[PDB]
Amino acid sequence: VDRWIRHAAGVERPQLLDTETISMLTFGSMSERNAAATVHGQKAACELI
C-alpha cells in the first residue's frame, strides 16, 4: 500500500537513506532539487484541515 500511495501521489520513495544520512536530515538537508524552469517565482503554499 506504500508503493501504491507513492505511485498515486507521484512522489518517489526515500530509497533507503542511510542512518547517518537520517541524522544528517534531522540535522538539516536540502532534499528537493530545483525545477526545470520558473517564470513566476519560487513556490509557496501549505495546508491545514
Binding site: 542512518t19 537520517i22 541524522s23 534531522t26
Partner: protein, 57 residues
C-alpha cells in the same frame, strides 16, 4: 535449623509492599521497552538497576 526469620522471609517481606507492585509495573514497562528512534535520541529527554540487595543463609 530453619527459622521464621530467615533469608527468604526478609527477601519477600519488601515484596508485600504497595511500592513493590508499583515498581513491578514500572520495571515491566521499563525493561520491555522498544528500541528508540533517533528522534528522541536527538530531542527527547534521556534515559537512566546497578546492584542487587540479596539475603543469605
Amino acid at each position: 535449623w530453619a527459622d521464621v526469620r530467615s533469608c527468604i522471609i526478609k527477601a519477600l517481606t519488601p515484596r508485600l509492599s504497595r511500592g513493590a507492585a508499583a515498581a513491578a509495573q514500572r520495571a515491566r514497562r521499563q525493561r520491555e521497552r522498544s528500541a528508540p528512534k533517533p528522534q528522541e535520541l536527538l530531542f527527547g529527554p534521556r534515559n537512566e538497576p546497578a546492584e542487587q540487595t540479596w539475603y543469605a543463609d
